[PDB]
């Protein structure tokens, strides 16, 4: 019964607000829409702005239109789109009236899209042009779908209503957005978002997240230590996908704060620096796969970045060395980190403002607790000991949609979620993520972490990107091996790469598995490495 080994989150600076997530969003955005010149979203590519006034008015119109159409808390809508200025209009609209929103990944193949909508069971589908065809090819197998609406069109498009013509079909005469009152409902039992889970074998799952979870996020995002201070005329640059929890709940919190969310979809070094300069960006929110595009640029000094105070990263490991280098080049105290799972709604470990520690992902957020347990007996471990990370609090998902068995396998009766990650916490209660548990390698009954070897590989100059896994061998079970994309203009050989690896490792950690040179390492949208795909590639090196 040792609670000295359970890391607890401090009390929030602000007490948790009442109301549904829709009510808190509506309140904040109405306030900002009544302040002249407030911009909610800016497309940095085409240089188009949308004010909080227009965004509020259109979200309210969508809420009333869906309500008049007949949607209520028994229904769900899908939002299938690349990032854009229109993404959050139907999301906010649905949140205002208690309709659950299921974002479907825009780059899903039709099979994965069918899975997502089979779980969410949407009545109405909001889809960009780029995604329409896939929706159609899937729609035949989901009779629950009664209405398809195009998001990035002003007129009807190819026989489908756009959000504007839909709204016009259902709004009453003389409707005034500022007299609209969002629906009230049980914030613990009404689902706000159904997100799709990642990483795990098999088809993704439906992660049901009630309004309560969004409300706790809205506590965090305006917290002076675990969030961002609400100061007028603040611009954020976001390059994170909106259908994913990392894009969803950061962007929602940014709206709660009245920030200006500046969007890039194609990431290039010079366009990034121009955008930071011209929009006076104070914080850039990134995934680590984008860092290489500017970490060693020579242009940084040619741009005025005096407004830039923060670079935040999330969704996957960020190299300590890359992070320290980038933080020092932009005069930053560090790269701010956030760790979360789709199943925890958002980051439940955040680097607190003013308390950076390089290589860590932060401390436990308010309302949450975290522990590290033994992989074989589940016993809680103590300081600086590695084990599985467990977390519990009011942003844990209510459960997987129609899958109670998976829910109970993930979350125990005390509410602890078993993250699947190896971590530890230090004397000051900072957490470090070591690796994914299902990606450890067994040399001779000793656990080798592929992330450590990757970081070492990544040190090298001739090595642009690396991914490590296990190649199967009847001796040792699996030997550790790599997949290496080299820097342009480099000659490195498998012999001298395994030798450089031997130079900074113990006995079992030696890369006795070889190297398979590649033109790119298989990553995900947030840049998690595809361990199954790396093992797959590690077959040509199994050949003779
Ligand atoms: N920060 C991190 N550092 C190292 N590894 C990280 C990581 N985050 C996720 N991971 C990995 O993603 C897996 C979780 O996978 S997941 O399905 O895709 N869910 C997520 O990745 C997820 C949901 S929310 C969220 C974040 N919200 C934020 C808000 C602010 C901020 O500054 C950073 C973040 S991250 N990330 C983790 O288990 C882990 O392996
Ligand atoms: C306080 C909140 O707005 C109401 C949610 C309860 C559970 O109905
Ligand atoms: C605030 C204004 O919209 C920025 C315009 C320049 C071109 O970025």
UniProtKB/Swiss-Prot annotation:
Membrane-spanning ranges: none
Locations listed in the record: Peroxisome
Signal peptide: none
Gene Ontology BP terms: bioluminescence
Cofactor(s) required, per the database record: Mg(2+)
UniProt xrefs under CDD domains: Firefly_Luc
Domain of life: Eukaryota
Gene Ontology CC: peroxisome
Function: Produces green light with a wavelength of 562 nm.
Family statement drawn from the similarity comment of this UniProt entry: Belongs to the ATP-dependent AMP-binding enzyme family.
Descriptive protein name: Luciferin 4-monooxygenase
Lineage, top ranks: Eukaryota, Metazoa, Ecdysozoa, Arthropoda, Hexapoda
């Amino acid at each position: 019964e040792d609670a000295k080994n359970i890391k607890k989150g401090p009390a929030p600076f602000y007490p948790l607000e009442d109301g549904t997530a829709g009510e808190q969003l509506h309140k904040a955005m109405k306030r900002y829409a009544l302040v002249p010149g407030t911009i909610a979203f800016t497309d940095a590519h085409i240089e188009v702005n949308i004010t909080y006034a227009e965004y509020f008015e259109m979200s309210v119109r969508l809420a009333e239109a869906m309500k008049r159409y007949g949607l209520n808390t028994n229904h769900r809508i899908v939002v299938c789109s690349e990032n854009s200025l229109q993404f959050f209009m139907p999301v906010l609209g649905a949140l205002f009236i208690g309709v659950a929103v299921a974002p479907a990944n825009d780059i899903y193949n039709e099979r994965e899209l069918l899975n997502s909508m089979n779980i969410s069971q949407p009545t109405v589908v909001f889809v960009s042009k780029k995604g329409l065809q896939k929706i159609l090819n899937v729609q035949k197998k989901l009779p629950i779908i009664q209405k398809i609406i195009i998001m990035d069109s002003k007129t009807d498009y190819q026989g489908f209503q756009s959000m504007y013509t839909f709204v016009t079909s259902h709004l009453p005469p003389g409707f005034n957005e500022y007299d609209f009152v969002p629906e009230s409902f049980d914030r613990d039992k009404t689902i706000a978002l159904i997100m799709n889970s990642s990483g795990s074998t098999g088809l993704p799952k439906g992660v049901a997240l009630p309004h309560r979870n969004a409300c706790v996020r809205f506590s965090h995002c305006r917290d002076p230590i675990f969030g961002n201070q609400i100061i007028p005329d603040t611009a954020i640059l976001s390059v994170v996908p909106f259908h994913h929890g990392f894009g969803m709940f950061t962007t929602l919190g940014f709206l709660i704060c009245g920030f200006r969310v500046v969007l890039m979809y194609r990431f290039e070094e010079e366009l990034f620096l121009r955008t930071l300069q011209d929009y006076k960006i104070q914080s850039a929110l990134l995934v680590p796969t984008l860092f290489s595009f500017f970490a060693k640029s020579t242009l940084i000094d040619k741009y005025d970045l005096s407004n830039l105070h923060e670079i935040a990263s999330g969704g996957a490991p960020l190299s300590k060395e890359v992070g320290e280098a980038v933080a020092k080049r932009f005069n930053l105290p560090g790269i701010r980190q956030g760790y979360g799972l789709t199943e925890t709604t958002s980051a439940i470990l955040i680097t607190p403002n003013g308390d950076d520690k390089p290589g860590a992902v932060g401390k436990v957020v308010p309302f949450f607790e975290a522990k590290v347990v033994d992989l074989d007996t589940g016993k809680t471990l103590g300081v600086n000991q590695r084990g599985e990370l467990c977390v519990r609090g009011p942003m844990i998902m209510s459960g997987y949609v129609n899958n109670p068995e998976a829910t109970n396998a993930l979350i125990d009766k005390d509410g602890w979620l078993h993250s699947g990650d190896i971590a530890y916490w230090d004397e000051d209660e900072h957490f470090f993520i070591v690796d994914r548990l299902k990606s450890l390698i067994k040399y001779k009954g000793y656990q080798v972490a592929p992330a450590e070897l990757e970081s070492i590989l990544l040190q090298h100059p001739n090595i642009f990107d690396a991914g490590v896994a296990g190649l199967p061998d009847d001796d040792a079970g699996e030997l550790p091996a790599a997949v290496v994309v080299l820097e342009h203009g480099k000659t490195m050989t498998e012999k001298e790469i395994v030798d450089y690896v031997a130079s900074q490792v113990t006995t079992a950690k030696k890369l006795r598995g070889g190297v398979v040179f590649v033109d790119e390492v298989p990553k995900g949208l947030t840049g998690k490495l595809d361990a199954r795909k790396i093992r797959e590639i590690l077959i040509k090196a199994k050949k003779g």
